[PDB]
Amino acid sequence: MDEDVLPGEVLAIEGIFMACGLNEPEYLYHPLLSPIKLYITGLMRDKESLFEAMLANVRFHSTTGINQLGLSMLQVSGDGNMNWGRALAILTFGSFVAQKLSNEPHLRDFALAVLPAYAYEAIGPQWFRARGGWRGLKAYCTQVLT
């Protein structure tokens, strides 16, 4: 029973989208995530063209389209595999979606209300916890060359 924890996980992910996607402050201080957000901001800069091309012919500026992107995150693990690279790809993609909605408040706010939960499920809370959760991801991001 990780019931006291699920709200905080969704909120931490939303703060990644707020910080990396929208360059704005979040609700609570998450020190472990500072290097993770820097890493994501770097992926977004160095791989912008790749992500923008993923959505090239996708009409995602709608609630149905945002939902489909959340369903896409869930399907990343369709082959039964998860790994840190995929987790970071999910978080980076969510941040890019927020960024691209930054001039459409209602859709931006919708994305921030649903994509964090989709990303939480897509990563896999059990998978993530068994690997040290955010402390694990912070160590991956700091110890390893891109």
Binding site: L43, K47, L50, M54, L55, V58, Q68, L69, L71, S72, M73, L74, Q75, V76, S77, G78, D79, N81, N83, W84, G85, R86, A87, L88, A89, I90, F93, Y140, V144, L145, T146
Partner: peptide
């Protein structure tokens, strides 16, 4: 054009990007 096709293709590309970026110890 199908929602299912759209989702499958995006997910595949995301998984491929993730797999290429991954720096976890690989399988033998």
């Amino acid at each position: 054009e199908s929602q299912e096709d759209i989702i499958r293709n995006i997910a595949r590309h995301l998984a491929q990007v993730g797999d290429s970026m991954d720096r976890s110890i690989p399988p033998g």
